[PDB]
Tab-separated table of C-alpha atoms in Angstrom:
chain	number	residue	atom	x	y	z
T	1	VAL	CA	114.005	94.411	104.806
T	2	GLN	CA	111.573	94.606	101.895
T	3	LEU	CA	111.526	95.385	98.172
T	4	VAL	CA	108.330	96.320	96.316
T	5	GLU	CA	108.112	96.550	92.525
T	6	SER	CA	105.467	98.698	90.858
T	7	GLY	CA	104.517	100.031	87.445
T	8	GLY	CA	103.902	96.753	85.640
T	9	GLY	CA	101.027	96.661	83.209
T	10	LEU	CA	99.950	96.266	79.605
T	11	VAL	CA	102.010	97.997	76.895
T	12	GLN	CA	101.665	97.947	73.119
T	13	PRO	CA	104.649	96.621	71.135
T	14	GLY	CA	107.042	99.482	70.509
T	15	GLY	CA	105.804	101.298	73.614
T	16	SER	CA	107.680	102.144	76.785
T	17	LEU	CA	107.257	101.611	80.511
T	18	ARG	CA	109.092	102.551	83.706
T	19	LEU	CA	109.099	100.202	86.690
T	20	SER	CA	109.916	101.181	90.266
T	21	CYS	CA	111.506	99.262	93.149
T	22	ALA	CA	110.913	100.731	96.615
T	23	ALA	CA	113.400	99.504	99.228
T	24	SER	CA	112.840	99.428	102.988
T	25	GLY	CA	114.717	98.278	106.065
T	26	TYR	CA	118.355	98.641	104.996
T	27	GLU	CA	120.933	101.085	103.646
T	28	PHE	CA	119.695	101.211	100.056
T	29	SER	CA	122.624	103.218	98.698
T	30	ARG	CA	125.483	100.842	99.596
T	31	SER	CA	124.200	97.639	97.966
T	32	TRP	CA	123.695	96.897	94.285
T	33	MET	CA	120.079	96.749	93.124
T	34	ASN	CA	119.427	94.266	90.310
T	35	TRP	CA	116.590	93.749	87.854
T	36	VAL	CA	115.748	90.131	87.013
T	37	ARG	CA	112.901	89.092	84.729
T	38	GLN	CA	111.094	85.827	84.081
T	39	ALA	CA	108.809	85.222	81.125
T	40	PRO	CA	105.698	83.164	82.012
T	41	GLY	CA	106.739	79.544	82.472
T	42	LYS	CA	110.359	80.304	81.523
T	43	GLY	CA	113.664	80.785	83.330
T	44	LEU	CA	115.232	83.696	85.167
T	45	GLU	CA	117.077	86.333	83.128
T	46	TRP	CA	119.428	88.915	84.628
T	47	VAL	CA	118.735	92.353	83.154
T	48	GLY	CA	121.160	94.643	84.950
T	49	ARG	CA	122.011	96.430	88.151
T	50	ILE	CA	122.871	99.821	89.609
T	51	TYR	CA	124.905	100.908	92.615
T	52	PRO	CA	122.618	103.640	94.004
T	53	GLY	CA	125.409	105.351	95.948
T	54	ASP	CA	127.114	106.655	92.803
T	55	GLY	CA	124.617	105.761	90.065
T	56	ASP	CA	126.976	103.243	88.457
T	57	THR	CA	125.010	100.916	86.167
T	58	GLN	CA	125.772	97.565	84.544
T	59	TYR	CA	123.608	96.058	81.797
T	60	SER	CA	123.539	92.713	80.098
T	61	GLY	CA	124.468	93.715	76.556
T	62	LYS	CA	121.103	92.421	75.327
T	63	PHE	CA	119.431	95.416	77.016
T	64	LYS	CA	122.159	98.083	76.875
T	65	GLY	CA	120.498	99.767	73.899
T	66	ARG	CA	116.917	100.288	75.042
T	67	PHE	CA	116.845	99.697	78.829
T	68	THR	CA	117.959	102.300	81.377
T	69	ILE	CA	118.345	101.628	85.109
T	70	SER	CA	118.414	104.529	87.574
T	71	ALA	CA	118.038	105.110	91.302
T	72	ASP	CA	116.964	107.828	93.743
T	73	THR	CA	118.742	107.431	97.081
T	74	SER	CA	116.569	110.178	98.586
T	75	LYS	CA	113.583	107.886	97.913
T	76	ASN	CA	115.306	104.502	98.462
T	77	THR	CA	113.992	103.564	95.019
T	78	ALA	CA	115.417	102.126	91.803
T	79	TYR	CA	113.881	102.310	88.332
T	80	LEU	CA	113.860	100.306	85.098
T	81	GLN	CA	112.925	102.327	82.009
T	82	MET	CA	112.219	100.042	79.046
T	83	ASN	CA	111.879	101.312	75.479
T	84	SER	CA	110.808	99.710	72.197
T	85	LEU	CA	109.118	96.850	74.015
T	86	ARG	CA	108.419	93.636	72.116
T	87	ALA	CA	106.182	90.674	72.896
T	88	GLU	CA	109.250	88.708	74.027
T	89	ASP	CA	109.782	91.309	76.775
T	90	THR	CA	106.604	90.070	78.492
T	91	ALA	CA	107.692	88.852	81.921
T	92	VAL	CA	107.449	89.304	85.649
T	93	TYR	CA	110.129	91.845	86.557
T	94	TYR	CA	111.820	91.501	89.948
T	95	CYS	CA	114.218	93.802	91.712
T	96	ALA	CA	116.777	92.045	93.887
T	97	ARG	CA	119.472	93.302	96.237
T	98	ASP	CA	122.881	91.657	96.087
T	99	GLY	CA	125.964	91.615	98.283
T	100	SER	CA	128.357	90.615	95.515
T	101	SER	CA	131.254	92.547	97.062
T	102	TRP	CA	130.978	90.173	100.038
T	103	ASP	CA	129.844	86.546	99.628
T	104	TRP	CA	126.569	86.206	97.693
T	105	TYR	CA	124.265	87.875	95.202
T	106	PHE	CA	120.471	88.072	95.295
T	107	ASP	CA	119.531	87.687	98.968
T	108	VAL	CA	116.426	89.938	98.974
T	109	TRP	CA	113.768	89.894	96.242
T	110	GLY	CA	110.642	91.883	95.571
T	111	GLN	CA	107.337	90.209	94.801
T	112	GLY	CA	107.648	91.071	91.101
T	113	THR	CA	105.484	93.083	88.739
T	114	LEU	CA	103.966	91.768	85.515
T	115	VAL	CA	104.704	93.540	82.225
T	116	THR	CA	102.584	92.334	79.303
T	117	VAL	CA	103.585	93.516	75.825
T	118	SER	CA	100.762	92.768	73.406
T	119	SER	CA	98.505	94.324	70.791
T	120	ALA	CA	95.560	92.903	72.747
T	121	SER	CA	93.605	95.541	74.647
T	122	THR	CA	92.370	95.458	78.230
T	123	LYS	CA	89.163	93.428	78.445
T	124	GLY	CA	87.135	91.987	81.300
T	125	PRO	CA	86.111	88.339	81.191
T	126	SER	CA	82.775	86.833	80.388
T	127	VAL	CA	81.754	84.500	83.216
T	128	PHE	CA	79.681	81.422	82.439
T	129	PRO	CA	78.513	78.652	84.780
T	130	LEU	CA	79.865	75.121	84.575
T	131	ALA	CA	76.663	73.468	85.764
T	132	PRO	CA	76.737	70.218	87.767
T	133	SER	CA	74.891	67.324	86.155
T	134	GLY	CA	79.014	60.863	95.700
T	135	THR	CA	80.980	63.950	94.665
T	136	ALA	CA	79.857	66.531	92.120
T	137	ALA	CA	81.950	69.031	90.191
T	138	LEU	CA	80.877	72.544	89.261
T	139	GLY	CA	82.640	75.695	88.224
T	140	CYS	CA	82.839	78.903	86.259
T	141	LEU	CA	84.311	79.564	82.831
T	142	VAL	CA	86.265	82.839	82.873
T	143	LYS	CA	86.701	83.564	79.178
T	144	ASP	CA	88.196	86.229	76.899
T	145	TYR	CA	90.009	88.581	79.265
T	146	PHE	CA	93.268	90.494	78.985
T	147	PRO	CA	95.735	90.925	80.477
T	148	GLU	CA	96.561	88.683	83.404
T	149	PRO	CA	95.618	88.331	86.199
T	150	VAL	CA	92.153	87.302	87.355
T	151	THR	CA	91.093	85.963	90.730
T	152	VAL	CA	88.222	83.585	91.446
T	153	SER	CA	86.749	82.898	94.859
T	154	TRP	CA	83.825	80.674	95.784
T	155	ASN	CA	80.968	81.740	98.068
T	156	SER	CA	82.852	84.958	98.868
T	157	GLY	CA	85.837	82.984	100.144
T	158	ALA	CA	83.818	80.663	102.391
T	159	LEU	CA	84.433	77.722	100.020
T	160	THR	CA	88.130	76.904	99.586
T	161	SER	CA	88.515	73.121	99.880
T	162	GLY	CA	88.584	71.285	96.563
T	163	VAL	CA	88.837	74.462	94.471
T	164	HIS	CA	91.028	74.365	91.356
T	165	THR	CA	91.487	77.621	89.441
T	166	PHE	CA	93.294	76.590	86.287
T	167	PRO	CA	96.267	78.504	84.871
T	168	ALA	CA	95.145	80.845	82.119
T	169	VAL	CA	95.838	79.755	78.546
T	170	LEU	CA	96.127	82.211	75.674
T	171	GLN	CA	93.496	81.563	73.011
T	172	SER	CA	93.999	82.071	69.281
T	173	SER	CA	92.217	85.417	69.715
T	174	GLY	CA	95.112	86.558	71.907
T	175	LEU	CA	92.841	86.660	74.971
T	176	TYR	CA	93.143	84.523	78.084
T	177	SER	CA	90.585	82.032	79.325
T	178	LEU	CA	90.409	79.734	82.328
T	179	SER	CA	87.977	77.690	84.360
T	180	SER	CA	87.688	77.579	88.135
T	181	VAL	CA	86.186	74.345	89.449
T	182	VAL	CA	85.295	72.843	92.814
T	183	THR	CA	84.183	69.393	93.926
T	184	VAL	CA	81.353	69.215	96.466
T	185	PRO	CA	79.109	66.520	97.949
T	186	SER	CA	76.426	65.522	95.455
T	187	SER	CA	73.906	65.539	98.316
T	188	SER	CA	74.534	69.284	98.763
T	189	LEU	CA	73.565	70.419	95.252
T	190	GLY	CA	69.882	70.834	96.094
T	191	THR	CA	70.240	72.919	99.257
T	192	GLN	CA	73.647	74.645	98.949
T	193	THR	CA	74.173	77.728	96.783
T	194	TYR	CA	77.425	77.981	94.825
T	195	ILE	CA	78.592	81.362	93.509
T	196	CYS	CA	81.916	82.202	91.891
T	197	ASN	CA	83.261	85.715	92.507
T	198	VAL	CA	85.477	86.796	89.611
T	199	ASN	CA	87.702	89.883	89.828
T	200	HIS	CA	89.722	91.227	86.885
T	201	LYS	CA	91.506	94.264	88.334
T	202	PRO	CA	92.906	95.655	85.020
T	203	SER	CA	89.363	96.215	83.693
T	204	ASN	CA	87.688	96.833	87.093
T	205	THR	CA	85.469	93.846	86.285
T	206	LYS	CA	83.678	92.190	89.207
T	207	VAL	CA	81.230	89.374	88.446
T	208	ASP	CA	79.305	87.094	90.785
T	209	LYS	CA	77.921	84.073	88.928
T	210	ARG	CA	75.392	81.739	90.516
T	211	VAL	CA	76.144	78.164	89.418
T	212	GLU	CA	72.979	76.090	89.473
T	213	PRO	CA	72.463	72.314	88.875
S	1	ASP	CA	128.483	84.667	77.191
S	2	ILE	CA	128.916	82.032	79.901
S	3	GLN	CA	126.322	79.304	79.359
S	4	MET	CA	124.866	77.567	82.420
S	5	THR	CA	123.321	74.156	81.710
S	6	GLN	CA	121.480	72.175	84.385
S	7	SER	CA	120.818	68.425	84.405
S	8	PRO	CA	118.200	67.137	84.498
S	9	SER	CA	115.727	69.734	83.223
S	10	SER	CA	112.976	68.104	85.306
S	11	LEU	CA	112.756	65.426	87.976
S	12	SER	CA	110.047	63.712	90.019
S	13	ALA	CA	111.414	62.182	93.223
S	14	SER	CA	109.737	60.603	96.229
S	15	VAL	CA	109.793	62.197	99.659
S	16	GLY	CA	112.901	60.907	101.410
S	17	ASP	CA	114.876	60.421	98.186
S	18	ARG	CA	118.382	61.711	97.622
S	19	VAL	CA	118.220	64.351	94.882
S	20	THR	CA	121.213	65.559	92.868
S	21	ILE	CA	121.069	68.379	90.314
S	22	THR	CA	124.159	69.239	88.274
S	23	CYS	CA	125.127	72.619	86.826
S	24	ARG	CA	127.675	72.851	84.006
S	25	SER	CA	129.253	76.153	82.959
S	26	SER	CA	130.612	76.650	79.445
S	27	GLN	CA	133.717	78.348	80.880
S	28	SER	CA	135.478	77.816	84.189
S	29	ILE	CA	134.255	80.234	86.859
S	30	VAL	CA	136.876	79.283	89.469
S	31	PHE	CA	130.528	82.795	92.811
S	32	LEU	CA	128.281	79.851	91.958
S	33	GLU	CA	124.888	79.945	93.656
S	34	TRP	CA	121.682	77.917	93.799
S	35	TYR	CA	118.213	79.459	93.977
S	36	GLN	CA	114.891	77.844	94.868
S	37	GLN	CA	111.670	79.205	93.374
S	38	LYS	CA	108.199	78.100	94.401
S	39	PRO	CA	105.476	78.543	91.753
S	40	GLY	CA	104.217	82.113	91.737
S	41	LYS	CA	106.945	83.207	94.164
S	42	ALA	CA	110.254	85.014	93.927
S	43	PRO	CA	113.451	82.928	93.995
S	44	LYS	CA	115.179	82.329	97.321
S	45	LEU	CA	118.933	82.061	97.807
S	46	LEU	CA	119.793	78.514	98.935
S	47	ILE	CA	123.529	78.019	98.314
S	48	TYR	CA	126.264	80.616	97.831
S	49	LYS	CA	129.936	80.290	96.868
S	50	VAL	CA	129.444	76.682	95.720
S	51	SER	CA	128.984	75.055	99.120
S	52	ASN	CA	127.662	77.572	101.692
S	53	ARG	CA	124.069	77.318	102.888
S	54	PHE	CA	122.292	80.646	103.213
S	55	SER	CA	120.881	81.576	106.611
S	56	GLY	CA	117.948	79.360	107.556
S	57	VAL	CA	118.491	76.793	104.789
S	58	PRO	CA	118.093	73.245	106.184
S	59	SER	CA	121.188	71.064	106.358
S	60	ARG	CA	119.735	68.598	103.834
S	61	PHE	CA	120.730	71.057	101.089
S	62	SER	CA	124.406	70.970	100.131
S	63	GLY	CA	126.461	72.213	97.201
S	64	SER	CA	129.738	71.028	95.704
S	65	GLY	CA	131.868	71.149	92.566
S	66	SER	CA	134.570	73.319	91.039
S	67	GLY	CA	135.666	74.802	87.735
S	68	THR	CA	132.859	73.943	85.317
S	69	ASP	CA	130.918	71.147	87.067
S	70	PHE	CA	128.741	71.752	90.120
S	71	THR	CA	126.102	69.813	92.034
S	72	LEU	CA	123.204	70.683	94.326
S	73	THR	CA	122.305	67.786	96.619
S	74	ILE	CA	119.180	67.224	98.703
S	75	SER	CA	120.031	64.386	101.078
S	76	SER	CA	116.385	63.595	101.930
S	77	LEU	CA	113.688	65.270	99.838
S	78	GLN	CA	110.986	66.805	102.030
S	79	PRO	CA	107.379	67.544	100.997
S	80	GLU	CA	108.092	71.298	101.019
S	81	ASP	CA	111.130	70.976	98.730
S	82	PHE	CA	109.180	70.940	95.461
S	83	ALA	CA	110.326	73.913	93.381
S	84	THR	CA	112.319	74.880	90.327
S	85	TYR	CA	116.014	75.118	91.197
S	86	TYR	CA	118.346	77.491	89.349
S	87	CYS	CA	122.094	77.693	89.404
S	88	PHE	CA	123.640	81.112	88.881
S	89	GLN	CA	127.143	82.400	88.168
S	90	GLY	CA	128.246	85.815	89.379
S	91	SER	CA	131.908	85.367	88.477
S	92	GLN	CA	131.949	86.765	84.927
S	93	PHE	CA	129.986	89.598	83.333
S	94	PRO	CA	127.278	89.277	82.187
S	95	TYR	CA	125.905	87.078	84.964
S	96	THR	CA	123.729	84.172	83.870
S	97	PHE	CA	121.220	81.714	85.311
S	98	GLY	CA	120.863	78.063	84.496
S	99	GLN	CA	117.689	77.088	82.689
S	100	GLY	CA	116.180	75.650	85.872
S	101	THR	CA	115.410	72.160	87.162
S	102	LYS	CA	111.769	71.611	88.123
S	103	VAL	CA	111.568	69.177	91.050
S	104	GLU	CA	108.117	67.690	91.625
S	105	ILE	CA	106.874	65.111	94.121
S	106	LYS	CA	106.576	61.491	93.024
S	107	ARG	CA	103.538	59.873	94.643
S	108	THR	CA	101.360	56.824	94.117
S	109	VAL	CA	99.172	56.528	91.033
S	110	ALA	CA	95.714	58.113	91.229
S	111	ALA	CA	93.269	57.860	88.346
S	112	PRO	CA	91.401	61.062	87.423
S	113	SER	CA	87.786	61.734	88.242
S	114	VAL	CA	86.176	62.946	85.016
S	115	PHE	CA	83.384	65.497	84.560
S	116	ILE	CA	81.880	67.167	81.486
S	117	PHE	CA	80.131	70.553	81.355
S	118	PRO	CA	77.886	71.647	78.465
S	119	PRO	CA	77.966	75.272	77.311
S	120	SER	CA	75.639	77.666	79.088
S	121	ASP	CA	72.596	79.098	77.342
S	122	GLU	CA	74.017	82.551	78.112
S	123	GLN	CA	77.211	81.870	76.155
S	124	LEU	CA	75.316	80.164	73.324
S	125	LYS	CA	73.135	83.249	72.862
S	126	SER	CA	76.394	85.139	72.218
S	127	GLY	CA	77.275	82.773	69.355
S	128	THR	CA	79.928	80.464	70.871
S	129	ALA	CA	79.850	77.058	72.577
S	130	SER	CA	82.535	76.118	75.108
S	131	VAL	CA	82.464	72.489	76.285
S	132	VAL	CA	84.673	71.761	79.295
S	133	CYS	CA	86.043	68.388	80.403
S	134	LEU	CA	87.587	68.161	83.873
S	135	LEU	CA	90.133	65.566	85.010
S	136	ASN	CA	90.464	65.903	88.773
S	137	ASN	CA	93.189	64.933	91.264
S	138	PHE	CA	95.300	62.489	89.282
S	139	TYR	CA	98.915	61.318	89.204
S	140	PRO	CA	101.131	60.997	87.212
S	141	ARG	CA	100.684	64.085	85.049
S	142	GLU	CA	100.393	62.285	81.701
S	143	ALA	CA	96.845	61.962	80.388
S	144	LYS	CA	94.971	62.109	77.099
S	145	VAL	CA	91.609	63.777	76.483
S	146	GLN	CA	89.851	63.033	73.195
S	147	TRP	CA	86.778	65.011	72.166
S	148	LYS	CA	84.172	63.109	70.162
S	149	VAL	CA	81.211	64.908	68.596
S	150	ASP	CA	78.577	62.519	67.236
S	151	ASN	CA	81.346	59.896	67.613
S	152	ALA	CA	83.681	61.958	65.384
S	153	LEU	CA	87.125	62.552	66.880
S	154	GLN	CA	87.953	66.251	67.124
S	155	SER	CA	91.246	67.943	66.291
S	156	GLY	CA	92.469	71.528	66.443
S	157	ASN	CA	89.507	73.009	68.357
S	158	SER	CA	90.481	72.327	71.980
S	159	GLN	CA	92.938	73.712	74.526
S	160	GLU	CA	94.212	72.157	77.754
S	161	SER	CA	95.360	73.610	81.060
S	162	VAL	CA	97.010	71.645	83.877
S	163	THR	CA	97.357	72.823	87.458
S	164	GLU	CA	100.615	72.936	89.345
S	165	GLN	CA	101.109	69.894	91.548
S	166	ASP	CA	98.934	70.214	94.642
S	167	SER	CA	101.041	70.989	97.701
S	168	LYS	CA	98.951	68.699	99.935
S	169	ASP	CA	98.131	65.564	97.907
S	170	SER	CA	100.683	66.012	95.068
S	171	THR	CA	98.046	65.483	92.360
S	172	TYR	CA	97.295	67.323	89.138
S	173	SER	CA	94.034	68.416	87.600
S	174	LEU	CA	93.415	69.140	83.938
S	175	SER	CA	90.844	71.095	81.951
S	176	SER	CA	90.168	70.550	78.261
S	177	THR	CA	87.950	73.124	76.561
S	178	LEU	CA	86.284	72.448	73.209
S	179	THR	CA	85.253	75.655	71.426
S	180	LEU	CA	82.715	75.646	68.598
S	181	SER	CA	80.620	78.283	66.907
S	182	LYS	CA	76.970	78.243	67.932
S	183	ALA	CA	76.086	77.028	64.424
S	184	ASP	CA	78.520	74.100	64.523
S	185	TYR	CA	77.361	73.217	68.044
S	186	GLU	CA	73.715	73.057	66.934
S	187	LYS	CA	74.529	70.609	64.115
S	188	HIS	CA	75.425	67.763	66.493
S	189	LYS	CA	73.871	65.885	69.404
S	190	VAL	CA	76.404	63.783	71.334
S	191	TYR	CA	79.314	65.601	72.990
S	192	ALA	CA	81.805	63.334	74.733
S	193	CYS	CA	85.243	63.610	76.287
S	194	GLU	CA	87.142	60.318	76.450
S	195	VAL	CA	89.931	60.132	79.032
S	196	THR	CA	92.907	57.802	79.334
S	197	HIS	CA	95.494	57.707	82.115
S	198	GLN	CA	97.921	55.036	83.280
S	199	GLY	CA	95.771	54.508	86.372
S	200	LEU	CA	92.684	53.780	84.238
S	201	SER	CA	92.206	50.225	82.992
S	202	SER	CA	89.772	51.428	80.300
S	203	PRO	CA	89.018	54.902	78.915
S	204	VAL	CA	86.542	56.989	80.894
S	205	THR	CA	83.899	58.660	78.734
S	206	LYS	CA	81.667	61.452	80.025
S	207	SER	CA	79.030	62.701	77.597
S	208	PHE	CA	75.828	64.695	77.263
S	209	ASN	CA	73.146	65.072	74.609
S	210	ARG	CA	72.685	68.632	73.366
S	211	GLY	CA	69.396	70.142	74.503
S	212	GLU	CA	68.521	67.312	76.896
């Protein structure tokens, strides 16, 4: 049993976006499918649900005006069409099956898909070394990218111990920035090469940055 | 319409501790459930219909209550039980979640290791100077980072980021980034981040001299 959300991305305020929820491994039509969202760092918020067997929908009144939930039982898929998006609609959107007619609600969840509503445009990060000066610290500054997410690896994934990739923080420019750091033996700085591999999928940006003492 | 209020909003408990989280509904709902959400993960159903453990949930989790007052109990907190816990009511439309209770692991005090990183020449050539101060593997979470530029305390030109508690050693790390224009950066020599933490007897200062 699996649920997979798709369609999340960057949308300008006032724009629209349709998300999808592909179900697998169970009779999709005879269980309610819910949409639940979670703004970054905030709580869970129930959006609404549909019974795919007959198309019956139920919305939290907050979204009844501009959100529309639908389902295609021939595709085992549910949809969330969102209109007139605002910045406060930025969230990870989950789809979740419930069994509310029996004993419990959300027993199966998808991984979630991120919807960012912002006037900021897609932009790949600049990558700058954080140069080391019996343990040393070094890293990479991953600055001025949008939207989330980015990934950082070290030495093409061969270096994982002691790595801290910090949560992105929104700058006053409306762009994200973070650092990824790692602690290593100071005796290794002369003979060990350290490279951060940065990937920002939304902009197709891939950057390898050699970090030298 | 139905308001779900959890108490406390946050808690740090030691492994082995008895943990109790309460959920208070603004109206009687006599379908109360408890969900557990790891950072960066989807929520997982823990308790359903007030007191029933979902399949696979360890016996240390238990739920109780009635009417408007409900309690999630962890009889012996385990290292893998750190999460944000949400209560949820499915009795009255529209269905609502509690605001969440973030449970983190209380461990022994560890003072941060401090490092400072000057801006790169590559970034400077673009007209901006980012100075980064790193506080590594510390507990508890509270710490203060003060930027001093030629011994002048800075304000309004730095941003901090703190990691989620490490799943293995239960520590935090913190980054503080000082951002200056290239012109402002070139006007000063000494760049220092001064760190305090309850595990530090005296502030830790890491500094560099511009262009050295």
